Ligand binder design. Structure first.
Ligand SMILES: Cc1ccccc1CNc1nccnc1C(N)=O
Ligand SMILES: Cc1ccccc1CNc1nccnc1C(N)=O
Ligand code: PRO
Ligand code: PRO
Ligand SMILES: [Sr+2]
Ligand SMILES: [Sr+2]
Ligand SMILES: [Sr+2]
Ligand SMILES: [Sr+2]
Ligand SMILES: [Sr+2]
Ligand SMILES: [Sr+2]
Ligand SMILES: [Sr+2]
Ligand SMILES: [Zn+2]
Ligand SMILES: [Zn+2]
Lengths: 485, 486
């Protein structure tokens, strides 16, 4: 059972949920954590959904080397300047120092695009759509947290190159909607689409799209995923050129995109849905949606009938494609199994006792609400299918309910401060300049609010002639601000 | 293709991996790009292997890629054979780290500190974990794609048991899965065996292995490893479990480790490829059938090509229709022949009108005319026969190039004809060093010495009582498969 409470010390509560659900194990290297099968099954459920959707878009899977030459890093100066401090360098082979150190990729733009230049020669060679599921190392000296901010993490990174900028722009918005589907349709988490500001965008690119989720217990928001439009900045310095289809001899730089989604999705799932009895797995991503546990255990003949009914319930649920597992381990107490699968977040626990079986009834226990329903054997697969749909809805409904009440609009730095101190997120009219974004972070700390995203669909239309909260420059858009990981 | 496989095998392999769009070279010496054409083979290998080990109780996970500086100090023999083959990270940007972290050449030192915390009772056993990840081995030898690479993709499974009997069973259970990958998926016969004390995984009990043979070069190659580690690692990391009957007494768990790398794709290329490019077994082929139009009437031709496409997709046959109007049909013919597509389905206007098509076999080049209503069944018969043809052709060259010799002179004359030989071996390490020296010096072939490949479980002939090794001095313990290796 858990120790620390979520409302109290959230940090120790988050560490207790990921360990006692058997998702995360620690490692003697700070910032690096172990993905145990219970956590890895969720990332595979996200992988199979995202891989199937991007393959429809013509995206193909591959794998590129993990070592970056120092010659390829300095190709894009702006891109290498923002990633320079968090690039882990290999400097020794065994015990002697390498004559030339090599870098571990925080991102493989400079690994793939040198090859993109060799492959792109004509218009027929476009569009290239490559993606890889791999690990990357970003050595941030901030104090890490599992899933939320790790120094090594798994992700997918797609790198697409187009002949025109129209198709490159429409793929960014489609990958962003796929990222939003993962959070809203699989993890039951509401997100806010938006564009990153000139300060919080991918250096070396054109613009950055992102999805931001809100964690009610901490009052902070977090970037769930990013889809970037690179334009021609990388193709200019990597010489990714192709011949014109109609005009002979004429050449044009390719328009490129890059999009990534990391294992942070799992930690956001726990921070939003996890309570004080452990984890809560959304039914769409729960590898075990229903668990059958026999209880009430005298006679050895009725015991053989109690185990047969549990098998009968498993076969009745597997027929309607419900992921059900029967925990029939005699070496464990039935009360032990209840608290075990509860910490792991199984949506429904199916209790079958000898008295309940003789009464043609079973007990379904909902993980999200804790409610107890004595369902009949005939209405098993129907109600259990109906309860599975209800848990996914309730998790999204109440998480979006906290989003609807903690995302308010303010127009003055006085309201901006008091609202932020109550653990909420604010939409403000913003000028967009970087030096004003620096002023907002320094002033709100006296910690410090950061820009989260410029919502595509803000809560209110920006009033004509309205100035930013700086008062010096006019406001260009409503921008979402708040404290973030 | 500019070179031939029988002529210069090195230049042929480099052109086949590139012109098949499987491998792209990188700036880093030893690093190679796994393009989608080669990557689809690895995904076909992994989704078969995952489905098998999941039946054995293995679950997938992922461990960090960095290992502590003191975690390697816990191991003496493991840090002895991995002494010259480990990369170290000491800087993040322009700042020094707390301690040098090492990129995993293998994750024994990463996973086992976690096993000790998880394993506290007998109910915690057995633990069966597996991960698909990348590994950096700083081998100062020869970076060749798939075969010998500094960085490569693999799977590593680490099991821990309470009994040694179940650990001994899983070592050979996994080894038999590695043999099915080469034989049933890649159509490559292999030799099950045990590695000698010289080539074994240092720090474990014994190492079982599968060895494949390449006719175009006479050199053999190891295709997979399944080690029994005994209680060696469990005593360093203190992986202990309480006895389920005796109060207080604890025992060290018995552990195994087994790995299979992307070298699978390299052996498939060398064994099945010919002077016309790559040759893909239909079981792992990214595209099994490519439809090529050989030509108003154009709308019906593009339709009939797409109709074979959906019909093959209906029966779950991997198919791609090449309808590019920029290239001639013959260009597409040699394009997909270089990429190794097993069946090339040609549709001409005359073929369409008479309700027929021409399916050619990549392995033999024969052109088969099939009626339209037999497209689903006949093509599956041709694909199934291409699979058995490649394996039987490979099995014929293994049975003809793996022969037994009993003397050192016969071993040398047979080995230098491009063969691999099973000889009576004593097992001594310094005797294995001497075999490598004599076979390299007295090489009267057409330069490298003979290396120990494996100790076969089922040798061609049983060893005679009191038989002496090829060294003459020490007695022989077993027949050992010898030959030049990669
Ligand atoms: C959401 C997203 C998209 C693209 C790139 C990075 C991220 C988030 N970043 C992380 N995610 C998980 C762990 N650690 C980190 C990190 N330290 O940056
Ligand atoms: C086949 C096998 C199984 C288990 C462990 C190691 C290997 C061989 N190792 C490699 N495999 C592919 C690329 N490079 C290498 C290397 N340089 O070690
Ligand atoms: O790191 C990023 O955010 C982008 C998207 C994946 C590759 N590079
Ligand atoms: O390096 C090796 O050979 C073993 C096999 C997988 C885990 N480590
Ligand atoms: Sr494509
Ligand atoms: Sr021009
Ligand atoms: Sr131009
Ligand atoms: Sr102004
Ligand atoms: Sr298991
Ligand atoms: Sr003792
Ligand atoms: Sr003991
Ligand atoms: Zn401003
Ligand atoms: Zn000898």
């Amino acid at each position: 059972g858990l120790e620390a409470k979520k409302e109290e010390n959230l940090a120790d509560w988050y560490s207790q949920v990921i360990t006692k659900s058997e998702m995360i194990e620690y490692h003697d290297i700070s910032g690096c954590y172990i993905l145990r099968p219970w956590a890895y099954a969720i990332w595979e459920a996200i992988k199979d959904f995202f891989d199937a959707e991007i393959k429809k878009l013509g995206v193909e899977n591959c794998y590129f080397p993990m070592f970056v030459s120092q010659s390829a890093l300095e190709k894009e100066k702006t891109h290498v300047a923002d990633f320079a401090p968090e690039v882990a360098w290999v400097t020794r082979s065994g015990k002697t120092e390498l004559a030339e150190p090599i870098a571990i990729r925080p991102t493989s733009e400079t690994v793939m695009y040198p090859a993109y230049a060799k492959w792109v020669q004509s218009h027929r060679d476009l569009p290239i759509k490559l993606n890889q599921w791999c690990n990357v190392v970003r050595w941030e000296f901030k104090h890490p947290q599992p899933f939320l901010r790790t120094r090594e993490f798994l992700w997918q990174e797609g790198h697409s190159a187009f002949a025109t900028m129209e198709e490159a722009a429409e793929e960014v918005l489609q990958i962003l909607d796929l990222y939003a589907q993962v959070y809203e349709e699989l993890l039951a988490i509401p997100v806010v689409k938006g564009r990153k500001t000139e300060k919080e965008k991918f250096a070396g690119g054109d613009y950055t799209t992102t999805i931001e989720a809100f964690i009610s217990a901490s009052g902070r928001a977090i970037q769930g995923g990013t889809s970037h439009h690179l334009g021609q900045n990388f193709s200019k310095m990597f010489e990714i050129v192709f011949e014109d289809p109609k005009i002979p001899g004429e050449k044009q730089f390719a328009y490129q995109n890059s999009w990534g989604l990391t294992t942070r999705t799992i930690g956001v799932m726990t921070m939003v849905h996890g309570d004080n009895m452990g984890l809560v797995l959304p039914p769409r991503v729960a590898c075990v949606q229903v668990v059958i546990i026999p209880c009430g255990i005298l006679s050895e003949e009725d015991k053989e009938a109690l185990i047969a009914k549990c098998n009968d319930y498993r076969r009745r649920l597997l027929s309607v494609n419900i992921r059900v597992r029967a925990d029939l381990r005699d070496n464990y107490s039935p009360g032990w199994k209840f608290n075990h699968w509860e910490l792991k977040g199984v949506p429904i626990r199916l209790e079958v006792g000898p008295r309940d079986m003789k009464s043609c009834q079973f007990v379904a226990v909902r993980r999200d609400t804790g409610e107890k329903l004595t369902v009949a054997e005939n209405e098993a697969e129907t109600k259990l299918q109906a309860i599975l749909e209800d848990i996914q809805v309730t998790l999204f409904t109440r998480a979006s309910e906290d989003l609807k009440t903690h995302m308010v609009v303010a127009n003055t730095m006085e309201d901006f401060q008091k609202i932020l101190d109550s653990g909420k997120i604010v939409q403000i009219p913003f000028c967009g300049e970087i030096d004003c974004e620096d002023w907002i972070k320094k002033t709100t700390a006296r910690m410090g609010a950061k820009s989260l995203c410029i919502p595509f669909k803000p809560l209110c239309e920006l009033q004509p002639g309205a100035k930013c909260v700086c008062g010096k420059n006019p406001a260009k858009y409503y921008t979402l601000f708040g404290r973030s990981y």
